[PDB]
């Protein structure tokens, strides 16, 4: 079976930090880009951060300078270090890998989701 498995969420005061981690099935992530998305109630799922196999990172404008995505290619694991958290960051966070080849999120594999709540 194909599995992505996340952890690290929680409840934290504004200005704090969290670290999300995600472990991927032995073959769906190698040579491929791994990413993080988030979804607040009543909103569509939206991009947060991604890191290519070669190590290039890119971020949503709203988290640039605050979040850092990294990855251990050998362990098939991706991480999201979340600093300077804001109430607007509250959402369910999902790690993701494209099961297709078009960056079309209808084709993505998703983790189960991990709740992040930032109290003001």
Numbering used by the authors: 1 to 120
Share the article's original sentences.
This glycan contributes to the structural organization of the Fc domain and determines its specificity for Fcγ receptors, thereby dictating distinct cellular responses. Unlike other glycoproteins, IgG harbors two glycans which are buried in the cleft between the two heavy chains, and are thus not solvent exposed or readily accessible on the surface of the molecule to conventional probes. In the present study, we present the crystal structures of the afucosylated IgG-specific nanobody X0 in isolation, as well as in complex with afucosylated IgG1 Fc.
We crystallized an intermediate affinity (~142 nM) afucosylated IgG-specific clone, X0, and determined its structure by molecular replacement, using its predicted structure from AlphaFold 2 as a search model, to a resolution of 1.8 Å. The loop architecture of the crystal structure for CDR1 (residues 26–34) and CDR2 (residues 46–58) aligned very closely with its predicted structure, however, electron density for CDR3 (residues 91–108) deviated considerably and packed closer to the globular Ig fold of the nanobody than predicted. This is demonstrated by several CDR3 residues that in some cases move >9 Å upon binding.
